[PDB]
Design a protein around this ligand. Sequence first.
Ligand SMILES: CC(C)=CCC/C(C)=C/CC/C(C)=C\CC/C(C)=C/CC/C(C)=C/CC/C(C)=C/CC/C(C)=C\CC/C(C)=C/CC/C(C)=C/CC1=C(C)C(=O)c2ccccc2C1=O
Ligand SMILES: CCCCCCCCCCCCCCCC(=O)O[C@H](COC(=O)CCCCCCC[C@@H](C)CCCCCCCCC)COP(=O)(O)O[C@H]1[C@H](O)[C@H](O)[C@H](O)[C@@H](O)[C@@H]1O
Ligand SMILES: CCCCCCCCCCCCCCCC(=O)O[C@H](COC(=O)CCCCCCC[C@@H](C)CCCCCCCCC)COP(=O)(O)O[C@H]1[C@H](O)[C@H](O)[C@H](O)[C@@H](O)[C@@H]1O
Ligand SMILES: CCCCCCCCCCCCCCCC(=O)O[C@H](COC(=O)CCCCCCC[C@@H](C)CCCCCCCCC)COP(=O)(O)O[C@H]1[C@H](O)[C@H](O)[C@H](O)[C@@H](O)[C@@H]1O
Ligand code: HEM
Lengths: 39, 223, 535, 53
Amino acid sequence: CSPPGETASSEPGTTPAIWTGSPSPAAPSGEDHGGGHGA
Amino acid sequence: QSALLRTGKQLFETSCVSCHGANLQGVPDRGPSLIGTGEAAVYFQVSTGRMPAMRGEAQAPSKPPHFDESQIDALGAYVQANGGGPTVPRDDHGAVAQESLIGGDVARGGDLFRLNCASCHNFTGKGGALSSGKYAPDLGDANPAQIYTAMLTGPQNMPKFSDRQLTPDEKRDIVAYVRESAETPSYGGYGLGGFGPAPEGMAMWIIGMVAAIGVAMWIGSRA
Amino acid sequence: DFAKLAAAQGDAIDSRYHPSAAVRRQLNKVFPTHWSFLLGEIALYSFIILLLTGVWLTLFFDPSMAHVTYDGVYQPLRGVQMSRAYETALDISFEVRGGLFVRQVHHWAALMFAASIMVHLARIFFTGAFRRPREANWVIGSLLLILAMFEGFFGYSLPDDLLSGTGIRAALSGITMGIPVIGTWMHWALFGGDFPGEILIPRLYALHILLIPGIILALIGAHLALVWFQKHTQFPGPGRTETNVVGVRVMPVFAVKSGAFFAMITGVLGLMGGLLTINPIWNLGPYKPSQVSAGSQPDFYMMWTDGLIRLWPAWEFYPFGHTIPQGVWVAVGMGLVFALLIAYPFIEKKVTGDDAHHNLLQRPRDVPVRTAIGSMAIALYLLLTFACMNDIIALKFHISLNATTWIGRIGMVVLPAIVYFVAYRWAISLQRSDREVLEHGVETGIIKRLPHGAYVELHQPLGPVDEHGHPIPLEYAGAPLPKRMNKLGSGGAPGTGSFLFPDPAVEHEALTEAAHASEHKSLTALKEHQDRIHG
Amino acid sequence: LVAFIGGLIKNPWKPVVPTAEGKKAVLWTSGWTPRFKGETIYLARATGRPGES
Ligand SMILES: CC(C)=CCC/C(C)=C/CC/C(C)=C\CC/C(C)=C/CC/C(C)=C/CC/C(C)=C/CC/C(C)=C\CC/C(C)=C/CC/C(C)=C/CC1=C(C)C(=O)c2ccccc2C1=O
Ligand SMILES: CCCCCCCCCCCCCCCC(=O)O[C@H](COC(=O)CCCCCCC[C@@H](C)CCCCCCCCC)COP(=O)(O)O[C@H]1[C@H](O)[C@H](O)[C@H](O)[C@@H](O)[C@@H]1O
Ligand SMILES: CCCCCCCCCCCCCCCC(=O)O[C@H](COC(=O)CCCCCCC[C@@H](C)CCCCCCCCC)COP(=O)(O)O[C@H]1[C@H](O)[C@H](O)[C@H](O)[C@@H](O)[C@@H]1O
Ligand SMILES: CCCCCCCCCCCCCCCC(=O)O[C@H](COC(=O)CCCCCCC[C@@H](C)CCCCCCCCC)COP(=O)(O)O[C@H]1[C@H](O)[C@H](O)[C@H](O)[C@@H](O)[C@@H]1O
Ligand code: HEM
């Protein structure tokens, strides 16, 4: 048999809009405070 | 030199303009366009011999060269002056560089030949089959400048591994691999081709197993 | 102190044990001296090589998938990521003294093993050595072929050179995922993870040193016990009735030629393990799942399998929310052919009606449809193999690759029919060719008839002759009848001297008279035994 | 018999790999899948350099 999910030519796609990549909540186990020192 | 361009034009008029239209165009459904392919493309396609060809078939195969190195520079500089594209790498003599192209590494060339293209040919650079009649050729009878200009401007069905896809360090590195994989001897016996198990089978039967059955019929009788 | 100590130690062995009864039963056992009855011995005699090399290969090979940079001697693989299976297989190839030779003669012994199993299956098939008393012997030999095939496939995949790593990806993981209900489950049970699951190569090493060759050694032991105690079969001939084995005994003759044939099989394997490269894993790469060859073909005894992948024409099914892929079919198909190759003697016991205890063989011309079904299977194997190097055939023998896989795809449907027709009628015409050598004689040179102009071929008869130009026509007896007077005692007396210088004539007379009288005594003793059986 | 086989039988559809939808199984998950949301997955080549970049 032919597989069911194929063969559909619409208008051939908008050009893919520029990848405004979201930031990363994989690193996010950490909060950048004012810093670390002695004083 | 303009006389070198004229020599390229004199050889161009009397070998190909039945299939390149004499304005470096493409004669439609008889021979494709030729500008932009460049001196590197014409060096690989006439220095191997292939493109001064005789039929449009599955793929135009290898053959003896139809012009010599004193004329390939003329023909390639003519096609680069009419068009313009990749050029053949040349040494400090002005001639085509063929020995300064072997890179200083082989293992990087082994991994890069193996990843990027050895799907098509083979591990050591023997031929491989392709889709409809076309086929990859052996890399044994391959001048290193022809290997660099083979991957640099991909003639027939091979991707043109460009100056920016593979860097010239990487391309010198691949031609370091294939000129010391199709040149190094098969360590440990006759090399039954380069591709393993089918010649090893056919040389198991008629060399090993035919000898085994011949010994078995010399020892035992028949009744 | 060389024969007296032999007698003392022999009386010691006969004192401790009581072996001499069950030793005399062994070294008076008769094996027949037909040449084809040595063929399966090759499948034994290379297999011992597969231990004697293979044990040696166990104590240098390190299976893993822990990714190591090479940092050894082989220059085109330096700093490249490789599994430690491939790294220590490279160490077998290049570090150890005589290591590449032992692993190459190991691979060639594997090829001679899995090829002589097929040659011997052709022997015992076409000669009919599988009906009633020996059908379980066929079954355990067939299972031994299956284990040989799967175990060799575990073998050359055991270093993960990528020419066989893509063989694991095609065969052992594309067909295994491609099984409908419990396919993915047996895949993830076989690998423990994804396709480069880190416990595949040690599991193949576990199955490949011991777990499959333990079953192979057990089946070879029980198999040669079934050949040993249950007596060997034989072709029918002069003094060869249903209930005797004629030939040489074990102790003076058969042990010598069997050990010498073991030595010459080892000689052929050693010569072709040195003089011919096999599995050049340094020319190949470490298995990385983004790079392939163009060949990507398995070893030849399994080239009929994925050649069957290469020829099965992309028929997939899609039930309600699922997928049967192509790889189910050959998973059926390899399950099909094996179920025809294990269970064949029961199949033709049902079809023919052979409910009789057969000990004498049948010559493969004497049984034309079974020889023709067999030649269907031989030529179908040759087609599925010869369209598995589809790639390199279309490479070298310049054919369109699509054209030669269509040649295979039609060939597996029409070429068994062609070879069935040719095989059946060729077996019948081989019958008729040695059923006219009885009604007529054996053909020779031509005499003309004297008073008129004729041309007779001057047939030489085999049995008793009548008073005129025709003999008494003999009956057929399942024997190879000689079709050349050459192979009879005609002109077979050259100079006995040397290759360069003759011996004196009285010595020639003594030698040829003694050899002629010994051959006459051979056929006289065999003929009087044949008359003792019927008279 | 189940003590023989039970060490082998893994569920392929146990959710193992972290994905943007959550934990998906391994067959529905290559390394091309996003881990949390739209992240930059660069289509990087493999310059076959021994180890460094
Ligand atoms: C005897 C026969 C198999 C009947 C069994 C019963 C049958 C009904 C079971 C079902 C089988 C059907 C349905 C499907 C076929 C699948 C097939 C049988 C797979 C099982 C594996 C096995 C049993 C294969 C068959 C045995 C094998 C082909 C016998 C060898 C051929 C002959 C009789 C031996 C002598 C040949 C020897 C002297 C060497 C001659 C040289 C010739 C050129 C060798 C041919 C040749 C061969 C055979 C290669 O395998 C090969 C592999 C890779 C490269 C090249 C070659 C190659 O050239
Ligand atoms: C006696 C003392 C002990 C000495 C050791 C003896 C053992 C031999 C090993 C010694 C080193 C020799 C191996 C050489 C090294 C080597 O590998 O052998 C190549 C293979 O080449 C060829 O075939 C041409 C060879 C033709 C000769 C005859 C062919 C052999 C036949 C008999 C094999 C039978 C097979 C079964 C037939 C099937 C039956 C069919 C019905 C030949 O190299 P070469 O010619 O120079 O160039 C390559 C290019 O062929 C190659 O296309 C190119 O791609 C590069 O590889 C290049 O290097
Ligand atoms: C040891 C000796 C062995 C001798 C065997 C000799 C072989 C027998 C005859 C073979 C005839 C082959 C003709 C093929 C010519 C061809 O190229 O046709 C192709 C596909 O045809 C075909 O394969 C159909 C033919 C199938 C043949 C039927 C098989 C018969 C069996 C009995 C033979 C098996 C023998 C195996 C032996 C194994 C050993 C057994 C003991 C079309 O596809 P393709 O070219 O890729 O695509 C096209 C673009 O190229 C093109 O530009 C465009 O214009 C389009 O056309 C496009 O479609
Ligand atoms: C040779 C004889 C062949 C007989 C086959 C039929 C006998 C089946 C008996 C096995 C019953 C189940 C045993 C216990 C298993 C269980 O509890 O099943 C759980 C969820 O499955 C299920 O309910 C489905 C159960 C249905 C079985 C489906 C598989 C059947 C067969 C066809 C598979 C082939 C196996 C043999 C071929 C392989 C050849 C090998 C050389 C797994 O969840 P999972 O989360 O992955 O837990 C993991 C721990 O199991 C695991 O050990 C541990 O390693 C952890 O990985 C852990 O994750
Ligand atoms: C049953 C018959 C056997 C066959 C058909 C067979 C087949 C093979 C094959 C084809 C290879 C690949 C060799 C290569 O290309 O490097 C191999 C490797 C190996 N064999 Fe076997 N083998 C058998 C029995 C054994 C036995 C009994 C042992 C050990 C006691 C063994 C130990 C090994 C090891 C460790 C390897 C991997 C090392 C390597 O491939 O370099 N084999 N085997």
